[PDB]
Amino acid sequence: QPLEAEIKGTKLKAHWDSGATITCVPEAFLEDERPIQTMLIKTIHGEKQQDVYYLTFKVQGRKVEAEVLASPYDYILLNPSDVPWLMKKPL
DSSP: OOEEEEETTEEEEEEEOTTOSSEEEEGGGTTTOOOSEEEEEEOSSOEEEEEEEEEEEEESSOEEEEEEEEESSSSEEEOTTTOHHHHSOOO
């Protein structure tokens, strides 16, 4: 059951993953954007750096802004730190 989210006014499906500590979005939303900060990641094949993008999107009808990473996926990934209310039941 994918969640609903709106990025830059664009409506798309999203997935909640507590394992993720940072929101992850598809480059399709960063193609014409710019990363405010970058992160360095070391891998067995070599060292890779991940760019960070601060975007604004609605989470279940809730305007919320957070940094997201660009990914080849076709959806969005929400973290438990950005959507702390999702863990709590709605009133």
